[PDB]
Amino acid sequence: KLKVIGQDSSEIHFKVKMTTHLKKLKESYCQRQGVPMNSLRFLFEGQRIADNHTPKELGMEEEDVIEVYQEQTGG
Amino acid sequence: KLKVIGQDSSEIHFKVKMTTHLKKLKESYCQRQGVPMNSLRFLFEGQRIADNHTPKELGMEEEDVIEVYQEQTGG
Amino acid sequence: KLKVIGQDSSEIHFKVKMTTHLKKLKESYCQRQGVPMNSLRFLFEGQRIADNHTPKELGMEEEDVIEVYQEQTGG
Amino acid sequence: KLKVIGQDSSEIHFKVKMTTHLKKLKESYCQRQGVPMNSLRFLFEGQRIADNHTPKELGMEEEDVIEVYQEQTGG
Amino acid sequence: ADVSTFLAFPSPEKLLRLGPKSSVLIAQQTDTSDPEKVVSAFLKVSSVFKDEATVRMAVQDAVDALMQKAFNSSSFNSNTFLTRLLVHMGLLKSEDKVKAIANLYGPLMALNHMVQQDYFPKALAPLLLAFVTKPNSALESSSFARHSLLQTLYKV
Amino acid sequence: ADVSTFLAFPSPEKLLRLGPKSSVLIAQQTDTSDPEKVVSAFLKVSSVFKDEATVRMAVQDAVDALMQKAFNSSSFNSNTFLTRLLVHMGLLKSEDKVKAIANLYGPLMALNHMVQQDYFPKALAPLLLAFVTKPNSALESSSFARHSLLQTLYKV
Amino acid sequence: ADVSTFLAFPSPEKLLRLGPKSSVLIAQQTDTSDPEKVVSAFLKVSSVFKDEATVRMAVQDAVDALMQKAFNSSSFNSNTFLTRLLVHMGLLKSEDKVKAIANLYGPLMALNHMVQQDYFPKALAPLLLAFVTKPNSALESSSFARHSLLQTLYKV
Amino acid sequence: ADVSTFLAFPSPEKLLRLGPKSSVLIAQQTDTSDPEKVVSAFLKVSSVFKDEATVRMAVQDAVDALMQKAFNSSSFNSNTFLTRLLVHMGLLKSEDKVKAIANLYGPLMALNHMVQQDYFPKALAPLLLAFVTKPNSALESSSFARHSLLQTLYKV
Amino acid sequence: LLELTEDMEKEISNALGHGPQDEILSSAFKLRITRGDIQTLKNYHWLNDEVINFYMNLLVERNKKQGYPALHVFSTFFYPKLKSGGYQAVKRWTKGVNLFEQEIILVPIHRKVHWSLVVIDLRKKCLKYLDSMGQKGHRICEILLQYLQDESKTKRNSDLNLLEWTHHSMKPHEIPQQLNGSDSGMFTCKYADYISRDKPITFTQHQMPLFRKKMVWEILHQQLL
Amino acid sequence: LLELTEDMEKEISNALGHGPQDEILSSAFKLRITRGDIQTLKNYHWLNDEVINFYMNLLVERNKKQGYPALHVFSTFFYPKLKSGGYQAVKRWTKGVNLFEQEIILVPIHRKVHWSLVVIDLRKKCLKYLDSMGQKGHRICEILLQYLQDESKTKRNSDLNLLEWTHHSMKPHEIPQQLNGSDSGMFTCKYADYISRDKPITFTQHQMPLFRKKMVWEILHQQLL
Amino acid sequence: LLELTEDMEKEISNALGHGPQDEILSSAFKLRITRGDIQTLKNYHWLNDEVINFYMNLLVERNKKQGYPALHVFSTFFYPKLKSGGYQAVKRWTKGVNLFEQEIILVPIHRKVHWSLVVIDLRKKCLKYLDSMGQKGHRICEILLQYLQDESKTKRNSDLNLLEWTHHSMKPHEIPQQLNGSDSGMFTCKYADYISRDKPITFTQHQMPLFRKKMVWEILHQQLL
Amino acid sequence: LLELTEDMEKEISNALGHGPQDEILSSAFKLRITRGDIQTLKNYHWLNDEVINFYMNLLVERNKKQGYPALHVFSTFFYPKLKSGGYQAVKRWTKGVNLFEQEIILVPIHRKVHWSLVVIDLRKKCLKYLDSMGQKGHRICEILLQYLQDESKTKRNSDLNLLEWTHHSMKPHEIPQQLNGSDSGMFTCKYADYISRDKPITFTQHQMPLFRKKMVWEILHQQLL
């Protein structure tokens, strides 16, 4: 059981068991969106959840929030 | 004693006695800003504080918040 | 009696007595044209007929041709 | 013996025997030019010398002039 | 399951590793009842384009699949699709141009004047000029798309 | 107290009701230690412009006051001023043009192709065309300012 | 005889040395039976414009004279006038744009490609770029007039 | 004798009916001592381009042949080539833009004013607008080439 | 149908023509519509926020002076605030009124360059999202609803069953769409002028220009015609 | 009026559609109309010189196969040459024919980006300059006339009295004008398709597009309809 | 000074040249820098957020492998979140570390199209806002400070006297400014590469291009040079 | 080298600055150089025909007041006329002078938007075509030569052997080329200021701007420096 609040409000409640990759949870989310993944990046309490990362190496708490932010560019 | 939080955070703490115009409190605020008044509009708990309006006809509570919003346009 | 063939063909037959200015014969021609004088310049057998110039200082032959050319620009 | 004066002056003196195609005389000319054939068209005394045409069906006089003109467009 | 993966985050090779079947594969795996999922798709597919026939053609043929399947169905509002596509390309909306211009008039009337006054430090003009000559102030984005689109519309 | 009032929210008449003294009045009541208050001013003053000599000239002469007083002082960074002015006019920054273009390439390559296919409903081209012909998709804002500015820079 | 002289070859001062009477003076001395003499006039008068109210206003008020007298008369084809004016401003005609573009497509497709190949001498790109950055390759003439005209047409 | 024929008057198929050998065939049959014959060639080859890989690639690969053979030789002025190419594409020269603009200023200042006066027949604005909306007054040729060229120059 | 009043047509051009950009041309509801403001009604211009917070208010009065459903209008600066400020930051907003007392609630909507309109028909117990650009809006309703639920179970302790509640986006083939990138402002007001009167959207593009004019008039006089 | 042939409409798109830009699509009069050429008839494109030297020739044949006035057509590359080459440089041009034998003479005209048409009605003893852009042309007639006078007093020693001769520009309010900067090509041919048949110019803009299509067809088959 | 490695120069063009736009070219800190990402370093392009969240991290390591002040780096997606989420919504952010233990804290800054940099020198007890565009930023520091005060009096109950604390914007005449509208990305990193090493900003524009290249290299190898 | 006169620099800006566009600023050779005219010397502007028919004349005088080769200058409106009017239409042009008496002949050249220069060095018995744009010009010389041959065998019955005569285009690697699309005007005058003095073209682009100024000065005073 989880959540993935975006840069807005959109609460897309999720669920999975703490062991296997989050990469699967990545594609999953970026599935029902208007702009791909590499336009987004997943952060959990700050640290940026890599793909090789696992809820098992993260120590995430069920019913936790995995915020997502959109690319930034400046010049 | 008052406040005028804008569409952002900027807390410009104010103060005046409940009787005289707010129009004076308008020009006052729009003084130290990057874009004039008519680009902004003053709302108090929702209702839009006209110029002819007075804290005396408003029933405002000292140490209250008079939010301000920027013009909107769509097409 | 004269002529003023332009950069094309247009034969605008003229006439005047050899003594007085040609400046009067200038404005005259540039009168019935689509672009002013300073867009044109008057040449007679080659030499460029100035304003201070006179048919009397030119030694022009009645029933002669005073060609006219349009400005040039390059870069 | 011939000539092919273009829309300018360029006298490219030619030569061939009155019998065989002029199409060969076409490509030939359009060879040493800055813009292809279909940008040009060959006229002889007015009538437009087709490819299927031959100096033998034209009754051309040696040391004659076969003028050439460039496409025109208006709107 | 190979289409969905590609769609998640497209890639030139991601499309190419679907062989000749990817064309109608994507097209059929995309519901055209609503003009949005269609655009949503039209975009992910072309978002892959790159000068290289392999990719070019793939995308084209691909798009054709989706668009034919698309047009051939009542449940399709080809006006909104079209519409909605122009807005994503920022060829439509994007800014209250009318107003945006209306604001510049002044600063523009001023700024020019200024440069022309004798008190304007000669060492400045060059900077100013050199400043609006840089690519971020020269390169036009949609004002470009738009022209290209017109050219084709006018057939040549 | 008449300058400050005008500045709060400018007006053609607001400036005109300051007579001939408004010129240096505004200029002197504006600290040029920092290039921002200056721009901040340069903008409010010109924001008033309207085709009508009365207003035109006022603003000009006005601006000249502020700008001379401005240039004549070490405490002034005429680079940042300049800079900072271009950004407000959106002649600088505003969008990652480089990227913005880079995205269109695809959808653009596609969208054109599409229109050209036989399956494209003839009744659509006209709509599309008529669509990018409307003023909100035709009128260019800064891409216009910029040209005007150049013309003067090139002296004619 | 003072109007005709001015018309021959206009001048800012040439118009100003006709006082307040020059306005309707020119307007009445110009036959509006044929839309050409009118344009012919409209042009000589405005050909004088220069940023300086004196001249500005003169011309305006002047033009207004000619144009009112003009519109108020059956013998006037305000379509051709209009037309004929756009062609002189080269806002119309001037080039077979359709074709002009059609030719570039190729050389353009090529030239870009070229620059992108590894065999393209790195020392060249900069030259090329610097080359199309110069004012004779940057400054747009009518493609500018046209925009200005639109802005007003759209009222703001 | 197959190269010369094609060059006389190019054709998509004319190039394609030279097989894979046409690439270096044309390139070698073109003397690069003088930058002109080269451009002269660069142009005839690309003048064939059309959206269709067959032709696209042919031309590219073709051009690459000519351009490598070209660059690799002292007898080559890659400045003039470049130069001379821009002039043919009318990206350079073509018009005294500086002057062209300088003339419009007046008629432009006038024409706008006019449209805005009350005496301007309401039935006209629409015509005028509709007039500069037509493709021969909207479609920009070189002012387009130029942008495309820049985009690539700026690498993206 | 209707036709224009030659004398009142020229009276509009005095409101839209040249002159001061601050010369107030109408007052009411605590909104002062100035030249600059009312100017946004010109052909192809984009309606600002006052030209709307107003017309949207004349709609309430016209529905109390011609007797139509209880109509509760919300301000343009409402949804945004709510979108980020939950209910807590909107509590004191509904002052002096029970929202559920009303029949219909009109909620204007500002997505950056766009004007949308959510109609919350309290009677039939559901809300409709009407957009003249085709653009969809599910998360919008979903959120707004969540305002009610709390505007209730917090401002009257009586909860709200979400089952009896519904919301849905009005498809492009249902309601009229716009054919440009300027008029979406009107499309939102006129969506209310009708939806409010329980009348069917039968209007379209080749009429909007006009709608614009009458609208400036309608606002001058404050008389909805 | 007329209506289009569904099958022959699609036959046009094969002449105007994609394909080779040299694939000759019609021959005659010694002019080969290729794809590139006939392509110039597309919407908004500018007619080249062959799409004209041809249609202008079908007009002659249609006026000898439907029996209309003796019609003598001149080539686009005629006036220009004459404009600079006097008569001497145009002598051998009128080969195998007495010009004054004819009733009407059609003369196309190329001003750089423009298509004009001079109609020299030999019968009524005068010529008319028809321009669809409003532009006037007095020096044009004045010059052309001067071709005749010499095409006579030099090619038959019999002079020509200029008094019995007249010329004049057809005002914009008389004939139809164009409303764009592309169609002046057609306006010149159709000016002949009628003026040739002594028929009044009753056509206009909201029809030209069509005129364009039939024209490509007309040229395919070489059958003027 | 420095000069480029002919072989490692060409190794850069393999990272910036054509190829896949996802082919990861470096990993670390939980950030995967792909082609697309590292591509943002090209001439005139705008640096994205990873090209920064990374270089800004190599700066920490280079200051622990060459021994410089305790350096605490914050992420690009930090300030924004804080700007709207107070401290409460940032609490769990500083996990596994006492911020005040550090000497210097680097905070990148994203104003929509701009890259700014706030340097919070914990030692001297004050923070500096460095902007390469001239733009000022008082409310930025004022806010950030307010993060500390609570990052303390809430994460250690020990308050914070604001008197001993200061902040100020670095004027345009102090630090180097940029002369275009693309390079502000670098100007922010290099502001750290130095400010971090307590070294004076002596660099300028006619060098940045280079800085860009080395930067892609620096990130390839993860070796700061 | 040379350096500018602070007081005479400001005297130039009075000739190039604002003011009347007809206020003659210099007279001589029957050419009146007005503001408009001399204005064409501004940065990036295109030199007109008088700024040249003049400087090209000061070159003659400077070569008779500093004693250089007999120099015969021809007008800008010369070649064109000749290009189309053979010799017959140019006969009376060379009035009061034997061309072959001269050593060097300077011939300016106008291709529509371009300024070229043909140098006919009568001494060495050949002519050189110098173009600062790379563009070649063989048919130009070939034609000009044909003017001489007749300017002789017709204006002195003494023919001309073409064998002893030569002409050739000066390659881009020989003479300096321009790096923009505005300065070709100067490149043609300065090609004469040197070629006239038998001096080698050693000048280039990063100097032309200046050349422009002195040139306006040079023309003010009519003193070539």
UniProtKB/Swiss-Prot annotation, chains A, B, C, D:
Modified residues (Phosphoserine): 10
GO molecular function, one term: potassium channel regulator activity
Record cross-link Glycyl lysine isopeptide (Lys-Gly) (interchain with G-Cter in SUMO2), residues: 1, 15, 17, 23-24
Ubiquitin-like domain ranges (all copies): 1-75
Stretches for region (Microbial infection) Interaction with Tula hantavirus: 15-18
Cross-link annotation Glycyl lysine isopeptide (Lys-Gly) (interchain with G-Cter in SUMO1), location: 3
Effect of residue 14 to A: Abolishes binding to PIAS2
Entry annotated with the keyword Ribosomal protein: no
Keyword Phosphoprotein: yes
Native source species: Homo sapiens
Localization in the cell: Nucleus membrane; Nucleus speckle; Cytoplasm; Nucleus, PML body
Keywords assigned: Acetylation, Cell membrane, Chromosomal rearrangement, Cytoplasm, Host-virus interaction, Isopeptide bond, Membrane, Nucleus, Phosphoprotein, Ubl conjugation, Ubl conjugation pathway
Record gene name: SUMO1
Documented effect of changing residue 75 to A: Abolishes sumoylation of ZBED1
GO biological process, any: protein stabilization
Assembly and interaction partners: Covalently attached to KCNB1; UBE2I increases cross-linking with KCNB1 and PIAS1 decreases cross-links with KCNB1. Interacts with SAE2, RANBP2, PIAS1 and PIAS2. Interacts with PRKN. Covalently attached to a number of proteins such as IKFZ1, PML, RANGAP1, HIPK2, SP100, p53, p73-alpha, MDM2, JUN, DNMT3B and TDG. Also interacts with HIF1A, HIPK2, HIPK3, CHD3, EXOSC9, RAD51 and RAD52. Interacts with USP25 (via ts SIM domain); the interaction weakly sumoylates USP25. Interacts with SIMC1, CASP8AP2, RNF111 and SOBP (via SIM domains). Interacts with BHLHE40/DEC1. Interacts with RWDD3.
Gene Ontology CC annotation, any one: presynaptic cytosol
Site (Interaction with PIAS2): 14
UniProt similarity note: Belongs to the ubiquitin family. SUMO subfamily.
Domain of life: Eukaryota
Residues of the whole record sequence present: 23 to 97 of 101
Annotated protein name in UniProt: Small ubiquitin-related modifier 1
Post-translational changes noted in the entry: Cleavage of precursor form by SENP1 or SENP2 is necessary for function.
Curated annotation (Swiss-Prot), chains E, F, G, H:
Post-translational modification: Phosphorylation occurs before nuclear envelope breakdown and continues throughout mitosis. Phosphorylated by the M-phase kinase cyclin B/Cdk1, in vitro. Differential timimg of dephosphorylation occurs during phases of mitosis. The phosphorylated form remains associated with RANBP2/NUP358 and the SUMO E2-conjugating enzyme, UBE2I, on nuclear pore complex (NPC) diassembly and during mitosis.
Subcellular location: Cytoplasm; Nucleus, Nucleoplasm; Nucleus envelope; Chromosome, Centromere, Kinetochore
Signal peptide positions (record): none
Protein origin, superkingdom: Eukaryota
Cross-link (Glycyl lysine isopeptide (Lys-Gly) (interchain with G-Cter in SUMO1)): 93
Phosphoserine modified-residue sites: 4, 11
Motif (SUMO conjugation): 92-95
Modification sites for N6-acetyllysine: 93
Tissues expressing the protein: Highly expressed in brain, thymus and testis.
Phosphothreonine: modified positions: 5
Residues joined by cross-link Glycyl lysine isopeptide (Lys-Gly) (interchain with G-Cter in SUMO2): 21, 93, 155
Site keyed Hydrophobic interaction with UBE2I: positions: 131, 134
Cysteines joined through disulfide linkages: none
Complex formation: Homodimer. Interacts with RAN. Forms a complex with RANBP2/NUP358, NXF1 and NXT1. Forms a tight complex in association with RANBP2/NUP358 and UBE2I/UBC9, the ubiquitin-conjugating enzyme E2. Interacts with UBE2I; the interaction conjugates SUMO1 to RANGAP1, and subsequently stabilizes interactions of sumoylated RANGAP1 with RANBP2/NUP358. The complex composed of RANBP2, SUMO1, RANGAP1 and UBE2I associates with nuclear pore complexes. Identified in a complex composed of RAN, RANBP2, sumoylated RANGAP1, UBE2I and XPO1. Identified in a complex composed of RAN, RANGAP1 and RANBP1.
Function statement: GTPase activator for RAN. Converts cytoplasmic GTP-bound RAN to GDP-bound RAN, which is essential for RAN-mediated nuclear import and export. Mediates dissociation of cargo from nuclear export complexes containing XPO1, RAN and RANBP2 after nuclear export.
Family: Belongs to the RNA1 family.
The protein's name: Ran GTPase-activating protein 1
Organism: Homo sapiens
Swiss-Prot record, chains I, J, K, L:
Cellular component aspect of the GO annotation: cytosol; nuclear membrane; nuclear pore; nucleoplasm; nucleus; PML body
Subcellular location(s) of the protein: Nucleus, Nuclear pore complex; Nucleus membrane; Cytoplasm
Active site: 114, 131, 184 (nucleophile)
Alphabetically ordered keywords of this record: Cytoplasm, Hydrolase, Membrane, mRNA transport, Nuclear pore complex, Nucleus, Phosphoprotein, Protease, Protein transport, Thiol protease, Translocation, Transport, Ubl conjugation, Ubl conjugation pathway, Wnt signaling pathway
Modification after translation: Polyubiquitinated; which leads to proteasomal degradation.
Spans annotated as Protease: 32-196
GO terms for biological process, alphabetical: fat cell differentiation; heart development; labyrinthine layer development; mRNA transport; negative regulation of protein ubiquitination; positive regulation of protein ubiquitination; positive regulation of transcription by RNA polymerase II; protein destabilization
GO molecular function, one term: SUMO-specific endopeptidase activity
Primary residence: nucleus
UniProt entry tagged with the keyword Repeat: no
Biological role stated in the UniProt entry: Protease that catalyzes two essential functions in the SUMO pathway. The first is the hydrolysis of an alpha-linked peptide bond at the C-terminal end of the small ubiquitin-like modifier (SUMO) propeptides, SUMO1, SUMO2 and SUMO3 leading to the mature form of the proteins. The second is the deconjugation of SUMO1, SUMO2 and SUMO3 from targeted proteins, by cleaving an epsilon-linked peptide bond between the C-terminal glycine of the mature SUMO and the lysine epsilon-amino group of the target protein. May down-regulate CTNNB1 levels and thereby modulate the Wnt pathway.
Subunit structure, interactors included: Binds to SUMO2 and SUMO3. Interacts with the C-terminal domain of NUP153 via its N-terminus. Interacts with MTA1.
Domains as described in the record: The N-terminus is necessary and sufficient for nuclear envelope targeting.
Similarity comment text for this entry: Belongs to the peptidase C48 family.
Protein name: Sentrin-specific protease 2
Annotated organism of origin: Homo sapiens
